[PDB]
Ligand binder design. Structure first.
Ligand SMILES: Nc1ncnc2c1ncn2[C@@H]1O[C@H](COP(=O)(O)OP(=O)(O)O)[C@@H](O)[C@H]1O
Ligand SMILES: [Mg+2]
Lengths: 410, 98, 485
């Protein structure tokens, strides 16, 4: 019955070359503790050196979500001991988040609801502690990888809205090319918070962090499951109060794994070792002009300018890459709808059974357009199409070429 | 003030072990240091900003170019407990809750 | 021992001229150490083998007439809380006994560049905390001028070794006066450069917003020389200032007539002993006798130095020291059953009483509820202390006053009472808080124990401090004294 106030916590891995405060590589091999250095190892007397692009990229996302980029901004130290957190303090941002008060519009039963995002700051991922028997083994390869947190206001009101938000946020950050946003690769992570407020309570319900959500689909389940969990338990006695919960991927439930005693003291305090950042207006601009046209703006175009199906505009604009390829293929003469079906159909297939990125293949908005026309020319039947594409796709170069570098034409 | 528990809470916050005999002692010492630290209360700080950095520098950012990580050899060279190429540490979680 | 007393400058030319051989200078050093350091106990980990080998290399270069470097062949002693690649760096604590770094500190990269020879690692209070070095989990260093009294803190070894004539120069770290306070107690010249003047990368942190590496020498000319050696921007230290002009000798020798000096009353206030007080007042005159204009000013907040220092430092320390848990390096507690224990025991087993008090008080001040009343509060007081200076510097060029309230004290005298020991940094604390450069030089003796005169200059204006400080050195100093001990 009661309202379901819940917000999402999405950590995002930046795909920079080097870690957040160290010059170590951000992409590491399988070999454990082989992608570290004195800094990641927290050896005594080392210092942090802020990754410049990181900041660039961070404030770019913040602006993508329509946040208000801070002018004065510095890092702080989040104190806490844990094997995969060597300094015993993760560098992050307390009061002056590089980003604040943003929002993304989603569409729920019927009409548009605007979910606002409270903040977006820069942190550093921690090492990984493999639990091997009695003892656990520590691997710092990942330690220090740049991260951006995106705290959503508690404006999202359902496990289905939750999905909606995450699906947008992801898509958007994606277009910013600052990350690959893949939960499969853990470069997109979500911690949820749910709490039921009997419609017309003012004071929010009592939230319960929902760890171990490793995918939009999953975040949904846990979210709706826990929604019921406490719904009924709120008919019994019950509080489900200041409690944390892990999500069992097989049963599909929420396991209680602790119960806050008060508030986790981290002794937040401004990192002295890092001079303060002053984001002048010219800085904001540089990174301002780096935000490509976001999905909603593109789709609208597609639907109301290129006379395209709304569903198509969808698929076609899930990821910036394709979207672009699409937009180019058409300014190349290729039929509008025909382009769309080849990207949704043909092309995507190829990409799938070869798990290759659309830009690593050997086709170009040009050589594609070339083939499309040949079809709308009649010069090539759809029969021949399924033949010339596969080759023209990756490790190919021209459209007619395969008709003569092989043998078929008209 | 400065009660036993508070001493244990601090001692708990930072990771330092302290048995009683040293806790009721730390109860006094902390009580003193703090009595001492109360001195700043004679300093008029109404509306004066806190100094975070003494050096007025600005925007020191490192160019995003990666540098190879040091060999697992070195990373580990100074750690006493290690295996399979990692740092070895207990894990039956926290003492008297785990 | 033979050149065991020569000054950097003379020990340099004497090598440039080929009268003495690099390996012999080194041969001399160790002779001195082996014959004198067991009494003084200024050193810790020695690096004799790698030193000789380095000298040997230098001799060849001496023949080939290829003697490059602002310190070619000159012996050097480093404070043990400064990473020295491949040696053994302990910050004087059980916690790091055996710790052999796998990287080089910038000051170290630099000196090495200048061909200075690393004789060994100098003692200090465990983790830079303390003002007598008595805490050093390894050995107690005494004062060359009186083996019964402390050599100061926390770079005690750093000043002792130099005052004993065990090396021509050395490095220390100053946080509350950890370089001057000793340089004072031992009648040697100690300088704490402007925060941001010398990289901190490689310096085992104590108080990130305060620490700063400084050189200790037997004279004002050598000191400056050495600073030129280590000062300068560093890409590994976001906080090192991008300052170009690193010529600190240029103006040394020049007169100071017309130089507006400010004698802050607070610096000759109550805390200051009588004999010391007198000594500094003469200096003022030895100063007026020279050209300098000495007018009395005021640094009202000076009294809040120690307290704020204590808090900001302990709080920061509280954090900068959490990284020690014996998992990646250092002391690992064996009686290991849980994870909590691993942390609680390795630390409680590796840190000394004092160091642990700091962290307590440091974690308390930052802890929720007390943050604003202690840490924040303190940070503000710091703001007030920089103003005391700013204002004054609008009308003056440098600030003078005694370096320490009293003359060095005895071992075990104030060791078993925390608060008091801190009362000796009454005159240095303000410096660090304002991130200003301070220099110490002897200006007199008492009961045979030296006294320290201090000059606090505007930021990055060390070339001037050395200036005004060199003139005074020409009127008084202990040059011809160290030789007799
Ligand atoms: N009672 C609640 N019900 C649903 N969501 C909540 C509730 N309280 C807080 N949240 C949301 O959960 C997230 C956590 O906020 P917070 O606890 O302050 O920081 P953190 O997530 O790092 O622990 C926020 O996005 C917030 O909007
Ligand atoms: Mg986080």
């Amino acid at each position: 019955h009661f309202e379901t106030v819940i917000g999402l916590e999405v950590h995002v891995e930046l795909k920079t070359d080097s870690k957040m405060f160290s010059p170590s590589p951000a992409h590491f091999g399988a070999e454990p503790n082989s992608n570290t250095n004195v800094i990641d190892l927290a050896y005594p007397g080392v210092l942090p050196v802020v990754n410049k692009r990181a900041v660039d990229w961070a404030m770019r996302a913040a602006m993508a979500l329509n946040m208000e980029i801070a002018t004065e901004s510095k890092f702080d130290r989040k104190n806490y001991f844990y094997p995969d957190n060597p300094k015993a303090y993760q560098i992050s941002q307390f009061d002056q988040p590089i980003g604040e008060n943003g929002y993304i519009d989603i569409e729920v039963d019927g009409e548009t609801k605007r979910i606002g995002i409270t903040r977006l700051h820069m942190e550093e991922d921690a090492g990984k502690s493999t639990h091997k028997g009695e003892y656990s083994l520590v691997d710092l390869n990942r330690q220090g990888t740049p991260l951006i947190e995106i705290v959503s206001e508690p404006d999202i009101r359902s496990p289905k809205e939750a999905y909606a938000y995450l699906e947008k946020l992801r898509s958007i950050i994606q277009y910013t090319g600052v990350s690959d946003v893949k939960m499969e690769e853990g470069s997109l992570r979500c911690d949820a918070n749910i709490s039921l407020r009997p419609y017309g309570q003012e004071k929010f319900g009592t939230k319960a962090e929902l760890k171990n959500l490793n995918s939009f689909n999953y975040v949904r389940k846990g979210l709706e499951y826990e929604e019921k969990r406490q719904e009924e338990e709120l008919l019994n006695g019950g509080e489900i109060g200041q409690e944390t919960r892990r999500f069992d991927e097989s049963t599909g439930k929420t396991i209680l794994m602790r119960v806050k005693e008060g508030s986790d003291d981290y002794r937040y305090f401004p990192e002295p070792d890092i001079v303060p950042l002053y984001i002048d207006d010219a800085w904001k601009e540089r990174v301002r002009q780096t935000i490509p046209e976001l999905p909603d703006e593109r789709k609208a175009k597609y639907v109301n300018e290129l006379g395209l199906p709304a569903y198509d505009a969808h698929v076609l604009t899930l990821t910036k890459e394709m979207s672009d390829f699409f937009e180019s293929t058409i300014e190349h003469g290729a039929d509008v709808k025909l382009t769309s079906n080849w990207l949704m159909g043909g092309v995507n297939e190829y990409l799938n059974k070869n798990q290759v990125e659309l830009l690593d293949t050997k086709l170009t908005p040009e050589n594609l357009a070339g083939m499309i026309k040949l079809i709308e020319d009649g010069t090539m039947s759809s029969k021949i199409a399924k033949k010339v594409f596969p080759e023209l796709a990756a490790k190919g170069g021209n459209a007619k070429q395969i008709m003569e570098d092989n043998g078929l034409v008209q | 003030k400065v009660t036993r528990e508070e001493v244990e809470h601090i001692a708990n916050l930072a990771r330092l072990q302290i048995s009683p005999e040293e806790t009721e002692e730390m109860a006094n010492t902390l009580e003193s240091i703090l009595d001492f630290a109360k001195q700043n209360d004679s300093a008029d700080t109404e509306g004066v900003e806190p100094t975070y950095h003494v050096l007025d520098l600005q925007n020191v950012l490192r160019e995003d170019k990666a540098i190879k990580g040091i060999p697992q050899e070195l990373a580990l060279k100074n750690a006493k407990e290690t295996e399979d190429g990692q740092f070895k540490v207990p894990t039956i979680m926290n003492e008297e809750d785990a | 021992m033979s050149i065991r007393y020569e000054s950097v400058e003379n020990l340099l030319t004497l090598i440039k001229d080929k009268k003495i051989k690099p390996s012999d200078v080194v041969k001399d050093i160790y002779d001195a150490i082996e014959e004198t350091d067991p009494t003084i106990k200024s050193f810790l980990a020695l690096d004799k083998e790698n030193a000789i080998k380095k000298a040997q290399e230098l001799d060849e270069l001496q023949a080939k007439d290829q003697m490059d470097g602002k310190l070619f062949g000159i012996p050097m002693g480093i404070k043990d809380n400064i990473i020295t690649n491949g040696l053994e760096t302990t910050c004087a604590s059980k916690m790091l006994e055996g710790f052999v770094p796998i990287y080089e500190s910038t000051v170290m990269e630099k000196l090495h560049k200048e061909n200075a020879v690393l004789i060994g690692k100098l003692n200090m209070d465990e983790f830079a905390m303390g003002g007598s070095t008595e805490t050093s989990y390894f050995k107690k260093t005494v004062n060359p001028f009186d083996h019964k009294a402390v050599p100061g803190g926390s770079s005690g070894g750093s000043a002792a070794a130099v005052a004993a004539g065990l090396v021509p120069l050395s490095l220390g770290s100053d946080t509350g006066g950890s370089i001057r306070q000793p340089a004072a107690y031992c009648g040697v010249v100690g300088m704490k450069p402007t925060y941001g003047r010398v990289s901190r990368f490689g310096l085992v942190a104590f108080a990130s917003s305060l620490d700063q590496i400084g050189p200790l020498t037997r004279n004002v000319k050598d000191n400056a020389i050495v600073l030129e050696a280590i000062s300068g921007a560093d890409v590994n230290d976001s906080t090192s200032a991008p300052v170009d002009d690193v010529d600190f000798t240029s103006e040394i020798g020049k007169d100071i007539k017309g130089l507006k000096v400010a004698l802050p009353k607070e610096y000759l206030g109550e805390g200051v002993a009588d004999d010391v007080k007198e000594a500094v007042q003469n200096a003022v005159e030895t100063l007026k006798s020279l050209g300098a204009v000495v007018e009395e000013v005021s640094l009202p907040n000076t009294k809040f130095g120690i307290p704020s220092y204590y808090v900001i430092a302990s709080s920061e320390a509280s954090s900068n020291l959490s990284r020690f848990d014996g998992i990646r390096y250092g002391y690992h507690s064996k009686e290991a059953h849980s994870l909590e224990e691993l942390y609680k025991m390795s630390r409680s087993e590796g840190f000394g009483k004092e160091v642990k008090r700091r962290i307590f008080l440091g974690t308390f001040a930052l802890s929720s509820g007390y943050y604003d009343a202690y840490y924040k509060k303190s940070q503000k007081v710091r703001t007030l202390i920089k103003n005391d200076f700013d204002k004054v510097f609008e009308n003056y060029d440098v600030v003078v006053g005694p370096t320490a309230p009293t003359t060095a004290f005895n071992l075990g005298e104030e060791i078993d009472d925390p608060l008091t020991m801190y009362a000796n940094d009454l005159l240095t604390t303000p410096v660090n808080l304002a991130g200003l450069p301070g220099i110490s030089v002897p200006c007199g003796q008492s009961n045979g124990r030296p006294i320290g005169l201090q000059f606090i200059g505007k930021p990055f204006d060390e070339k001037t401090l050395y200036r005004v400080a060199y003139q005074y050195e020409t009127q008084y100093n202990l040059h011809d004294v160290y030789e007799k001990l």
